[PDB]
């Protein structure tokens, strides 16, 4: 997350923090997640493409801090991981960058709601906000593209949706971008998502309820002019979701 500000997990209670064990007991933050159902988290498949083994990932809800434990947070294993069949990335762009994780705690419980722990509203077929609308993104991603550490407290920041006709442009990302994808940047490019923010939520206020209209997927820079972020547009995966999502 470039620009932005630090938040507590409460401003963003649907966020999920995904860790991978390197073995030894060694864990590292991999990707962000959004909790869409009390037993289901959704992310990007690139986050796990190289190490698909499920018995190997860890999800934390209600976690606002990275290596200190928040109060109220719950820990889960991964009952199942499902990457999108037609996931491709022979190029800058990812395609179909969408993954689901089935979580369950050591006590067998799925996710219990609270002020820390909330689900996120999926969009609906035709409810994508206007271009120029202001959604928020959040995560532990780096705070400068040339940086070594990850910020230890969660961040958030607000970007404005960009029309697909606009970032299909030469100066932008030309043919690299499809209509199953959704661009979004600051208008003076002062703030964006960065490495680490992958798999986290693009959230918009829709008819009141907070909603998950995008997933952090890819972009060229971290907040360069004419080089926005890019998101999996969740409306175009509602069947795939639905299909896989039930189980």
């Amino acid at each position, epitope marked *: 997350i470039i620009g932005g500000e630090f938040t507590t997990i409460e401003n963003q209670p649907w966020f999920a923090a995904i860790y991978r064990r390197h073995r030894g007991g060694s864990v590292t933050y991999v990707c962000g997640g959004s909790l869409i159902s009390p037993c289901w988290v959704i992310s990007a498949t690139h986050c796990f493409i190289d190490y698909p083994k499920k018995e190997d990932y860890i999800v934390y809800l209600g976690r606002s801090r990275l290596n200190s434990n928040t109060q109220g947070e719950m820990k889960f294993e991964v009952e199942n991981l499902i990457l999108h069949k037609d996931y491709s990335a*022979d*190029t*800058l762009a990812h395609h179909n960058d969408i993954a689901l994780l089935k979580i369950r705690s050591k006590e067998g419980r799925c996710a219990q709601p609270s002020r820390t722990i909330q689900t996120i509203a999926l969009p609906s077929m035709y409810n994508d906000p206007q271009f120029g609308t202001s959604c928020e993104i959040t995560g532990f991603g780096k705070e400068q593209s040339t940086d070594y550490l990850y910020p230890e407290q969660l961040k958030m920041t607000v970007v404005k949706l960009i029309s697909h006709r606009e970032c299909q442009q030469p100066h932008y990302y030309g043919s*690299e971008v*499809t209509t199953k994808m959704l661009c979004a940047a600051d208008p003076q490019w002062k703030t964006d*998502s*960065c490495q680490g923010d992958s798999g986290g939520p693009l959230v918009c206020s829709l008819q009141g309820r907070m909603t998950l209209t995008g997933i952090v997927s*890819w972009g*060229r820079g971290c907040a360069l002019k004419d080089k926005p*972020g890019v998101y999996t547009r969740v409306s175009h995966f509602l069947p795939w979701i639905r299909s896989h999502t039930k189980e």
Partner: antibody
Amino acid sequence: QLTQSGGGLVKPGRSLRLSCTASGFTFGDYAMSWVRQAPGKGLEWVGFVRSESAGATTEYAASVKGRFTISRDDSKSIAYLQMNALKTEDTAVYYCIRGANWNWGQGTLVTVSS
Amino acid sequence: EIVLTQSPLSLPVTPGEPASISCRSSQLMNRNGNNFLDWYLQKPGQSPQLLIYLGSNRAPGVPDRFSGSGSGTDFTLKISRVEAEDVGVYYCMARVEAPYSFGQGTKLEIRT
């Protein structure tokens, strides 16, 4: 993995279609790249076709965007680089590439000569 | 679009000594850390083979003596210790976006 057929001698201004038959992997899951060399000098990248899952759009290089086009046929699992108005400066050994970069072929020298 | 100049163009080495070529560009990162610069070697014969992909990941089967490194605009390939078989031209390549492009090449000449 990638046998390059087609090619040879052609007169300037004339055309030609280099094909490339693939095996051992799923052809539909990959972009297909093409890179030239031209005897004595280094590599120029020339174009690609996207996976199809990604829209099978094509990018080209500055030199060739006018003349060259580059196709695919998931069915027969081939990629094809059709070169149209052919310039003598187009003489090179042309490799099929698979992916961005994964597995080059052996290429086929095209020589454009009277 | 992106122009790479690699240095040096020829480079003589005694097998068992380490070599180091360096590609200098002007662009290049994505949002997951990876720089989109690859290293090939064309062995005498023909047909380039990919050595390092994505800046620092060694392609499969590529021996352990090769190493991807760099950041920003300055990337460099490294052989801990040359071998007879490593003779060739090395090409670095930029594939962040838009049109792709190569360097001019580096000719590693290697003996009693």
